[PDB]
Design a protein around this ligand. Structure first.
Ligand SMILES: *[C@@H]1O[C@H](CO)[C@@H](O[C@@H]2O[C@H](CO)[C@@H](O[C@@H]3O[C@H](CO)[C@@H](O)[C@H](O)[C@@H]3O)[C@H](O)[C@H]2NC(C)=O)[C@H](O)[C@H]1NC(C)=O
Ligand SMILES: CCCCNc1nc(N)nc2cn(Cc3ccc(CNC4CCC4)cc3OC)nc12
Ligand SMILES: CCCCNc1nc(N)nc2cn(Cc3ccc(CNC4CCC4)cc3OC)nc12
Ligand SMILES: *[C@@H]1O[C@H](CO)[C@@H](O[C@@H]2O[C@H](CO)[C@@H](O)[C@H](O)[C@H]2NC(C)=O)[C@H](O)[C@H]1NC(C)=O
Ligand SMILES: *[C@@H]1O[C@H](CO)[C@@H](O[C@@H]2O[C@H](CO)[C@@H](O)[C@H](O)[C@H]2NC(C)=O)[C@H](O)[C@H]1NC(C)=O
Ligand SMILES: *[C@@H]1O[C@H](CO)[C@@H](O[C@@H]2O[C@H](CO)[C@@H](O)[C@H](O)[C@H]2NC(C)=O)[C@H](O)[C@H]1NC(C)=O
Ligand SMILES: *[C@@H]1O[C@H](CO)[C@@H](O)[C@H](O)[C@H]1NC(C)=O
Ligand SMILES: *[C@@H]1O[C@H](CO)[C@@H](O)[C@H](O)[C@H]1NC(C)=O
Ligand SMILES: *[C@@H]1O[C@H](CO)[C@@H](O)[C@H](O)[C@H]1NC(C)=O
Ligand SMILES: *[C@@H]1O[C@H](CO)[C@@H](O)[C@H](O)[C@H]1NC(C)=O
Ligand SMILES: *[C@@H]1O[C@H](CO)[C@@H](O)[C@H](O)[C@H]1NC(C)=O
Ligand SMILES: *[C@@H]1O[C@H](CO)[C@@H](O)[C@H](O)[C@H]1NC(C)=O
Ligand SMILES: *[C@@H]1O[C@H](CO)[C@@H](O)[C@H](O)[C@H]1NC(C)=O
Ligand SMILES: *[C@@H]1O[C@H](CO)[C@@H](O)[C@H](O)[C@H]1NC(C)=O
Ligand SMILES: *[C@@H]1O[C@H](CO)[C@@H](O)[C@H](O)[C@H]1NC(C)=O
Ligand SMILES: *[C@@H]1O[C@H](CO)[C@@H](O)[C@H](O)[C@H]1NC(C)=O
Ligand SMILES: *[C@@H]1O[C@H](CO)[C@@H](O)[C@H](O)[C@H]1NC(C)=O
Ligand SMILES: *[C@@H]1O[C@H](CO)[C@@H](O)[C@H](O)[C@H]1NC(C)=O
Ligand SMILES: *[C@@H]1O[C@H](CO)[C@@H](O)[C@H](O)[C@H]1NC(C)=O
Ligand SMILES: *[C@@H]1O[C@H](CO)[C@@H](O)[C@H](O)[C@H]1NC(C)=O
Lengths: 768, 768
């Protein structure tokens, strides 16, 4: 019971520990900075709005501001919305920030600014001006930034935001920024490394530029540098999904052998897409502490078979040599140099896109005694042959990734993976064979792999009648992803040899379920004694040879994207107890099953401990709410995206345990007279995207409403007449969380009130 | 144009040739028969409504009625809607039909009637009472039906509409119906064939009943019978998708060897699902003219290898022996008796669900000299091996169907396929291998099959880099369905050996398009010199190695379900001419491509003769209508299911050629002042399912409206005030075809008019 309603269209959080008062106005369709922002505001976010200008009046009384995030109020045309394009660039008048003596962070990215804003306070530590039109850096324009530590200037001149000229940086522009630690000049059309840079730099990003050559002294004074990224300078442009201009004569980025001598603290070196043909060992002479090295998207296929530089990297943790294939060559094998054995600290090795026909055990011998190796990624290599038993010498690994290959019996190609916008590994040893050509499996294929905990066979070509003998050696397996295959459940003994199986995914195996009159033994679960979760989504199941699925252990069943409407055809009672004997089942997802109605017997046929039931996206037109009495343990009921027109007369007379009721996206036009009357257990109600006009106190008693963790009412058809007097007052003065109050909890009428938020509604004429 | 607007909620057609006045009130949510039905009405349909009763007032003036179709006004609970269930059965008071002296047809199906309606006129020839609760036939209740020719009484006692007792038919109930030709007692729980039936019967349907035995004299007097169906009496219940009770001791339907002796005119005999183990030749002794024989869903696997009865069927056109497999037996081969060679007239032979491992050439030798054979269907047999070259001896066939098998290098199971509700074959010789396990193809696989015109490899496991050598022998092929495979377009020479290919379907081959950084040669079309149509739907294409697709012959390209939003990413101009060099292209479907906007250059990049463009289901939020000037041959533009808010100021100034404009399912709230001014080529406009409130005369000039073949305005937000005076009058008096006028061209306001049809609107108060 608030005494003064909050009409400000921003979320106001109070973090009393750090004295911070956070005002978040992100994406509120604002054309001006709203009035009434708290005077003690420390963090103000006005991101994704259409405020055309900043002036001394903008933050006049907000003297305690430590951060202003004013991003994307005039986003460049190619990066922004075409339905609501920005007409003019953001105008910043003088003395807008100079009075803010506590300002530490200022983000003005994506506003089409032509110059670095001046009159900034001396307390500023972070300045961000990405995706603007600033492509000439002058020393006089950086004088104000004396105490700056982090400076983002990238994305001011590239294909999604062109400047039509080379980027210019005056000599020693950044040299006297004595506290500068992070400098990013990525995606800027830069032609040379700016010199002299301040020796305090810890991170330097110069990737996706036009730097053809590094001078031997470009990084001579950067003895504190930890991260250096020169990627995308002389890029490898074959199959580039973005406009890509390589260096002439197919030349690499020219780096002198002594260019990194001063970088004794370097931990990360990124040389992705630099068209490199050799990696001279001399580069890493003085770099002893290097931990991450990205050499992907170069022409290093031959170098991988020699790689003498690896002898100088005993502390390297991560090495990436992906997409170094030679065009038009299909190598018979992967030639890894013996030098890989000197990478004592290596945890992750990635060599995708090398392109070779057959993987043999001895080709991985240089990796055999790398004691800290955790990930070996050889995906996207068009490997046709691989004896999986070779991985018996790789039991210590966490993931063996052979995904996207031809084995049978956006990251590397995105322009800027760090661009700013406006899984079974946890089970243990994983062998990922997903998106391969395995059409048939036999026990001998998995010999010597009894240590595996997860096997991903998703997206293979397996059209087999499994009988419980195919995975016999996989005694420790806990997770089997068999999705996107053609499983034929002729035998109820399928998967029974996987005695420790906890999760089975057989989703998207619709092939044999789509053809009429063939056997489907859905009772196969009875033999899996420790199975906790079963997924059989998108199988188009409309028939079954077994009338009951049984399990003493299963807790979760996902059965979405099937045809329970056909199995439960009215007059056919045979499958109304299909899930009844899944005695420990707690979660059942039967959404997207074309259930326009539920026959009588479905609720009585549910297993006894059912907690979360989803009947979403079914086209449900009616629902006998009283039948929820059968589900004595129901806590969550999802009826979203259906065609329901009513709520129960008494929700308490339907379920004594229901905590979360989701009714969003239905056709509800009104609530029953005593809907939530005495439903004291309800903690979450979603009635959003319905057609409710009125809500009276009898339907929504305050003794129930105040207990709610959340109440969603947005996108309804609220009629703001004098009959809505209680609802409007309650919404304005309630502590109960209701999202979208200042953006989509609106009056649709009458007249004057059409389109008006109920939070700003004044109904004084109703009490004269 | 019209002086008296039509306010009747039914469609009224006038067929002056056959002298009919057709009034169709189907599915109009009627609770009473509407007043003002034309007195000359001959055919009155009131199907799917909620009219609770019929009385002498119902058809008082309609003396010229020849047909009353009053079906499904009180559909049985298990067959009808659960959101709007019928409360009480249809009440028919006396003298409702007795005055209709020209009534020839009366359909009262699905109304929960308890007895055969009495007081029917003597002119009645067809009476239909399916899906009612009439399960006792008495001779006295049939005396009124003296001139009846067709009588449907089925579906009155079965699992979807139970009666809880056996069906009763009095002795000789139908005997004195001297003109009865068709009698259907299907799905009725009948225990014996009713006798004596009138000798004038041409068709008798007794399927899906509890008849365990046929007496030798049950059909002794039926010398005019052409169709006899006794299916589903002692059914084969393995994998039945409906409640199925077999005859005890697994006994078949017992048919004496001489039961069909009087049926000299029998053309169709259906013995589907009768658990038959033998087919005695003696059954067909006096049946010389039999044309169709259905013996599917029996236990005739052994009989197929003997089948001496086939020697007595030289005129048989269609033979079905599907789903006769022995449970738990996987035969090595198909044993077809040599007796099949005596089926001289056979055109269609179906033997699905026989279940055998290997198909060999000599197993089909009994079929070699059957000169009229057109269809050989061996689908759903779990065949693992088959030399496709064997079909060189079957060049005369139209279709060889091996669909749903395991070959590698609802019809038979529906309860009642004739239940009443309330393709490349045209190219020539087709070989259907769809839904098989072919993972790799080579030229030799298709040796001796140069005669084929269509090959369906849809839904196989082909993950190959085709290079133009795999289909070398298929010189005459015109249609290749390669959908639902894993095509890898590494080579632009794929499919080039198919020199006569007119249609290529490579839809749903998304596998290799979903993985980043691999080659995709979309320029492969250049080599296909007579290709007319290319389908590459649902491939998730977001990248391409070729910037242009080329073709001198292609007329139709389907590219729906891809990611042109990614290929045409703003700032990337490389693929804006992807379709430009498809010089003869007339139809382009680029719907479902996530195109929230179209970058500049898309329209200029279109090929010159483009006539039909679909941009449906894209989430398009804006559209520069002026760019249609580039498409000088555009005739059809589909912009349905998008988020457009406006129409062009003057459509004629955007396109001089546009004839069909589809804007249904958008967010349009108003039309421009002169929208259709001088749009002389416009013939079809769909503005349905938008949010239009008002339409003024200026937007819709009469010289343009009079050329429209159709104008769709339904499901809008029409505001029926005095400002809508022109629109309301025009809708009422126009001759332009506007569908859904009496069901979904409604006022949403103000007050009194909410929910009212604009056709029934009286605005006389606006002119006083
Ligand atoms: C087709 O006709 C048969 C009879 O020829 C109908 O079956 C009969 O149905 C009734 C009602 O379901 C059965 O009676 C009940 O039996 C149970 C069990 O003994 C008893 O507890 C009840 O009090 C009641 O007496 C009757 O036994 C059963 N007869 C046979 C021989 O099965 C059948 O329902 C009809 N089909 C349809 C679809 O209406
Ligand atoms: C990781 C990036 C992959 C890009 N390349 C690829 N994209 C796609 N789609 N498929 C590919 C399959 N392969 C293997 C391959 C390589 C070279 C040659 C041709 N060499 C012969 C000429 C004389 C020797 C044939 C090959 O396979 C049949 N590379 C592929
Ligand atoms: C047309 C309806 C098909 C119904 N049956 C079927 N439903 C489904 N899903 N898959 C099937 C695969 N097959 C072939 C088959 C038949 C019998 C036996 C068992 N016999 C062996 C004991 C010694 C011989 C094994 C078989 O394959 C492994 N029939 C199947
Ligand atoms: C309010 O602004 C301050 C200052 O810009 C933010 O402080 C940063 O918090 C992160 C952790 O989230 C630290 O890693 C940084 O070192 C802090 N920066 C400075 C300069 O102190 C703070 O996070 C902002 N709060 C919110 C919620 O926006
Ligand atoms: C990067 O800088 C180059 C120049 O170094 C820009 O290229 C020039 O662009 C103009 C306008 O298109 C042309 O008239 C010149 O001929 C180009 N010069 C050269 C050498 O190519 C380029 O546009 C800049 N990049 C971006 C994305 O703006
Ligand atoms: C109007 O009713 C007559 C009589 O019921 C229908 O006539 C049938 O037309 C079909 C198709 O030509 C014939 O096969 C039937 O034999 C005719 N029946 C009789 C009894 O003559 C006519 O089709 C109905 N018209 C419409 C459009 O409903
Ligand atoms: C591996 O590659 C190197 C060159 O990179 C070559 O010297 C060596 O002989 C190759 N060995 C094998 C086994 O291919
Ligand atoms: C696979 O390798 C194992 C050794 O780990 C060996 O026993 C087995 O025979 C090999 N099989 C094949 C097909 O090479
Ligand atoms: C298996 O791999 C697919 C990708 O091919 C991925 O979507 C899925 O999450 C993986 N399974 C698990 C359990 O990690
Ligand atoms: C399962 O099939 C394999 C051959 O694939 C066979 O060795 C095994 O005996 C079968 N299992 C049973 C229970 O017959
Ligand atoms: C599944 O049901 C069949 C009968 O249809 C039975 O033979 C089989 O043992 C059942 N399987 C399990 C694991 O209960
Ligand atoms: C689904 O049930 C699990 C317990 O089985 C619970 O952790 C989860 O919160 C439930 N989902 C919701 C939305 O409450
Ligand atoms: C609870 O609901 C049932 C069904 O609607 C009804 O019969 C019962 O009377 C209700 N309780 C009360 C107190 O009326
Ligand atoms: C074919 O089946 C019949 C019995 O139906 C048997 O007499 C005959 O020997 C069988 N021949 C072959 C080749 O299987
Ligand atoms: C397939 O049959 C043809 C005869 O038409 C023969 O030439 C060919 O060798 C056979 N192929 C195989 C794989 O047996
Ligand atoms: C190929 O078969 C599939 C069914 O497997 C069918 O949907 C498709 O229409 C067939 N292709 C043609 C061109 O008839
Ligand atoms: C295409 O593949 C076949 C089969 O591997 C091969 O014989 C043929 O030489 C290939 N074509 C070319 C042009 O390499
Ligand atoms: C497709 O383009 C490639 C170059 O990217 C070229 O080698 C090939 O000949 C082209 N194919 C056709 C059929 O034009
Ligand atoms: C126009 O082309 C579309 C496909 O883009 C097609 O579905 C439609 O039937 C065509 N209409 C006419 C009148 O040609
Ligand atoms: C559009 O209308 C203007 C004004 O009448 C005219 O100048 C122009 O030529 C027209 N363009 C087209 C494409 O009809």
């Amino acid at each position: 019971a608030r005494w003064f309603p909050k009409t400000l269209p921003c979320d106001v959080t109070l973090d009393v520990s750090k004295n911070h008062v956070i005002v978040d106005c992100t994406d509120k369709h604002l054309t001006e900075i709203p009035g009434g922002i708290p005077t003690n505001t420390t963090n103000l976010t006005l991101t994704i709005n259409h405020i055309p200008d900043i002036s001394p009046a903008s933050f006049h009384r907000l003297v305690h501001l430590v951060e202003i995030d004013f991003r994307c109020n005039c986003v460049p045309i190619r990066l922004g919305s075409k339905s609501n394009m920005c007409p003019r660039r953001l105008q910043i008048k003088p003395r807008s920030f100079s009075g803010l003596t506590y300002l530490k962070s200022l983000y003005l990215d994506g506003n089409q600014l032509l110059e670095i804003p001046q009159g900034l306070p001396p307390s500023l530590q972070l300045l961000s001006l990405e995706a603007n039109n600033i492509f000439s850096i002058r020393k006089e324009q950086l004088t104000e930034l004396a105490n700056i530590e982090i400076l983002y200037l990238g994305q001011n001149c590239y294909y999604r935001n062109p400047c039509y000229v080379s980027y210019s940086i005056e000599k020693d522009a950044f040299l006297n920024l004595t506290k500068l630690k992070v400098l990013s000049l990525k995606d800027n059309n830069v032609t040379t490394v700016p010199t002299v840079l301040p020796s305090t730099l810890t991170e330097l990003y110069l990737y996706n530029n036009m730097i053809a050559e590094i001078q031997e002294d470009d990084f001579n004074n950067l003895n504190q540098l930890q991260i250096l990224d020169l990627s995308g300078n002389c890029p490898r442009c074959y199959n580039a999904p973005f406009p890509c201009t390589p260096c002439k004569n197919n030349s690499p980025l020219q780096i002198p052998v002594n260019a990194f001598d001063a970088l004794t603290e370097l931990k990360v070196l990124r040389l992705h897409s630099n068209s490199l043909q050799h990696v001279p060992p001399r580069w890493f002479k003085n770099i002893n502490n290097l931990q991450e090295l990205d050499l992907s998207q170069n022409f290093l296929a031959k170098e991988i078979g020699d790689a003498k530089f690896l002898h100088f990297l005993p502390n390297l943790i991560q090495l990436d040599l992906s997409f170094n294939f030679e065009l038009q060559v299909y190598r018979a094998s992967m030639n890894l140099s013996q030098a890989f054995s000197s990478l004592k600290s290596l945890k992750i090795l990635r060599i995708r896109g090398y392109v070779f026909k057959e993987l043999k055990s001895f080709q991985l011998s240089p990796l055999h005694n790398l004691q800290n190796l955790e990930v070996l990624d050889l995906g996207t290599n068009f490997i046709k042959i691989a004896n999986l038993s070779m991985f018996k010498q790789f039991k210590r690994l966490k993931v063996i990734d052979l995904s996207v290959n031809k084995i049978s019996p956006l990251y590397y190609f995105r322009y800027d993976k760090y661009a700013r916008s406006c899984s079974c590994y946890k089970y243990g040893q994983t062998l990922d064979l997903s998106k391969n050509s395995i059409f048939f499996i036999k026990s001998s294929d998995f010999q010597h792999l009894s240590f595996l905990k997860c096997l991903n066979l998703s997206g293979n070509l397996i059209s087999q009648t499994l009988n419980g003998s195919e995975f016999q050696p996989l005694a420790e397996l806990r997770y089997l992803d068999f999705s996107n295959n053609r499983l034929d459940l002729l035998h109820s003994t399928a998967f029974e040899e996987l005695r420790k199986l906890e999760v089975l995914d057989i989703s998207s195996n619709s092939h044999y379920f789509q053809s009429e009159g063939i056997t489907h033994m859905l009772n196969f679960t009875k033999n899996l004694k420790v199975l906790q979760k079963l997924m059989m989504n998108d199988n188009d199941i409309s028939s079954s040879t077994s009338r009951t699925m049984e399990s003493e252990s299963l807790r979760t069943l996902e059965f979405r994207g099937n045809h329970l409407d056909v199995l439960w055809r009215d007059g056919d009672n045979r499958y109304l107890q299909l899930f009844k004997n899944l005695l420990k089942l707690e979660e059942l997802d039967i959404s997207k099953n074309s259930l326009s109605f539920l026959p009588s017997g479905v609720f009585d046929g549910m297993p006894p401990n059912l907690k979360n039931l989803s009947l979403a996206k079914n086209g449900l037109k009616s629902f006998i709410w009283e039948k929820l009495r059968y589900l004595k343990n129901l806590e969550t009921l999802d009826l979203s995206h259906n065609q329901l027109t009513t709520v129960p007369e008494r929700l308490s007379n339907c379920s004594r345990s229901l905590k979360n009721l989701i009714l969003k996206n239905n056709q509800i036009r009104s609530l029953t007279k005593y809907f939530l009357q005495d439903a004291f257990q309800l903690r979450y109600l979603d009635l959003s995207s319905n057609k409710i006009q009125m809500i009276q106190k009898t339907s929504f008693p305050e003794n129930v409403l105040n207990n709610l963790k959340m109440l969603l009412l947005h996108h309804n058809r609220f009629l703001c007449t004098c009959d809505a007097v209680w609802f409007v007052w309650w919404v304005q003065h309630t502590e109960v969380t209701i999202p979208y109050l200042a953006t989509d909890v609106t009056c649709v009428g009458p007249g004057a009130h059409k389109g008006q938020s109920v939070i700003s509604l004044d109904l004084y004429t109703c009490e004269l």
